[PDB]
């Protein structure tokens, strides 16, 4: 499932070429949010020592992220 499929998801959520580029940049930003959140989740899991992450880890990470945003 490519990034263009996520752009299709976003356009069907909101419903030419320049708006396609805008939505593609939006999909890239969404992937950046997910990657940063998962990186914070691993950082906190390694801080606690657990090999995997858990829902409370990533909930705390995303609350700390949205606190700054």
């Amino acid at each position: 499932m490519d990034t263009e499929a996520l752009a299709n998801y976003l356009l069907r959520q909101l419903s030419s070429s320049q708006e396609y580029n805008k939505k593609l940049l939006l999909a890239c930003g969404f992937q950046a949010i997910l990657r940063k959140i998962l990186l914070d989740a691993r950082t906190r899991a390694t801080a606690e020592g657990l090999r995997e992450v858990y829902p409370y880890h990533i909930e705390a990470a995303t609350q700390a992220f949205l606190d700054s945003q």
Binding site: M1, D2, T3, E4, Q31
Partner: protein, 679 residues
Amino acid sequence: SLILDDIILSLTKTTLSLLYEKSKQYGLSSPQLQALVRLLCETSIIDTVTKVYIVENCFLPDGYLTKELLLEIINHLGTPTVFSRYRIQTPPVLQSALCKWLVHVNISSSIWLHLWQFSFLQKWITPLVIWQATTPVDVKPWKLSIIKRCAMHPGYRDAPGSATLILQRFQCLVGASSQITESIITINCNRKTLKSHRNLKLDAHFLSILKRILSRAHPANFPADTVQNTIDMYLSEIHQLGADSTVSLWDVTSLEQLAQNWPQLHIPNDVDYMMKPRKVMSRDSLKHLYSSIILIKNSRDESSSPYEWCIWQLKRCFAHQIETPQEVIPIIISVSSMDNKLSSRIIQTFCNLKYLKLDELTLKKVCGGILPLWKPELISGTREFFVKFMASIFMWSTRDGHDNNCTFSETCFYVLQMITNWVLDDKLIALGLTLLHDMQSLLTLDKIFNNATSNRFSTMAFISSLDILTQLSKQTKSDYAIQYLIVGPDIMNKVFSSDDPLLLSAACRYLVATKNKLMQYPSTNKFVRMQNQYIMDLTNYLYRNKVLSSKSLFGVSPDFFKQILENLYIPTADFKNAKFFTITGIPALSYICIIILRRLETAENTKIKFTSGIINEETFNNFFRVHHDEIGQHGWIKGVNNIHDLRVKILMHLSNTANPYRDIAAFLFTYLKSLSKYS
């Protein structure tokens, strides 16, 4: 054809159909393919479904694909970027279909690898970069870094499985470029997507269309079978991916290379690779000639590397060390069938009882691959060694109690072929003929070759020996001794008593040949009367029916032969002493004459069929008695009135060019004054 590029220049509906049918009949040339793809890519007035129909149905090459066609195609596979906006974007489905058509048919490897970063091309670029990587030096850590970076990159679909396939091919290819299996571990571990990627379909209807077009194309340039084999091996390379002043011999790629640097050629000590086994010239392109090149560069002696390799890989086969003792056995056979020193060394070190005990199948194969070509270096001592070897293998076969074991007979056939090779040369012919006599003595012993426990292997070896004797007797220019064509009476009467029709035919052939040789010899010698005894006994047993009146038959007086007939009950005692001592009374030739009689009845469309299942005088008389008025006018074989005429008419049909029993008919037509006119 000119219609194809005429339509191409016209395009610069009817034209499309004409191009399709002329491609399906002739196929385009490489400049024609260049012009067609150049016209198709640059314009966009042509429909895209017709574009993919063209690239899947019209592009049909005739010969080599030139480099200029690939360069022109590569110009069209690019994309508009910030440094190139004037050129229009080629449709991605057209690019993917063109790459798929490329699948259907050091710089260029990097060209195709840098085009692999395109997302839509990845489903067909991967076989090209697999097939380009043929040498370990082709791969490099920068290629691995780019492949891993694009593989683990998001936004792609086919990149994980296909790039895992690329990395698997690289791991199977180089065995270097420090370990990359953990990089494979970092990429997907599903074994499903690359499982579907490792087998690829090429639209076998289009493959058959190109097959027939290319078969219509150039003689001795892409024949159909080699094209199918090349396509099959290119697909199997994808399929089995689951598991400076002097020049080295590896880097030599063409026959032109060996000339100017033969005194500057360095042969390596990498014997296992160059002896264990493509349109590109590489190290494996000239792998066939490496074994001979070593023995030319280093003068022939029993210390060279191919000799040691053949000896070691044959000892591994004998000791059951190799898993598959059928991949290197043809290699050893091909190397050592020639090169007399190696074959003689193998014969001296392996043709004995000890290695026969270890594995008789591999010994049988190496006897088939070495013995028929061997010519000895030392004449003395070869005969005694071969008698010892044949005696050892004969005891080994006969102690088992199983008469199905045919290794002794098969190796005997091989050494008779060696004797054929020996007697083809005028020198050392006495050794070969004496060895032939020893083999005839071993073949006729009643341990394998009996009248109850049959062995057609021994009969085949015997008739092979008789064929070689007949072919030897026709050579006038060789002054061999007269005593080496007889085999003694004890073999000849025994094989006359044997009930094998092919063997009796071979014996008659041997008699015909040895009499035609013996006619210029004096009429009264030690062996002329021996041949006379042979022919009189065989004619009396075959046609005369006068066995009881003779002095002896096959060295046995007819009183015992009559006493066997006594106490031997026959249902009808009309003609008992002459019923079954003839051509129709021989055990090997009884039903054969009935088959011949039935075929003669069928050929003449006779309404009367010989109902009795035996041809004898009593049955013949009863058959004429039951249908006398029908026989008298018409409805049976013409020109026959008695049993002797029936036998002559049978002998006519055995002399035709349809049976392997020519020689018995010629024997009866030769040494019988009554039958001398039927020759």
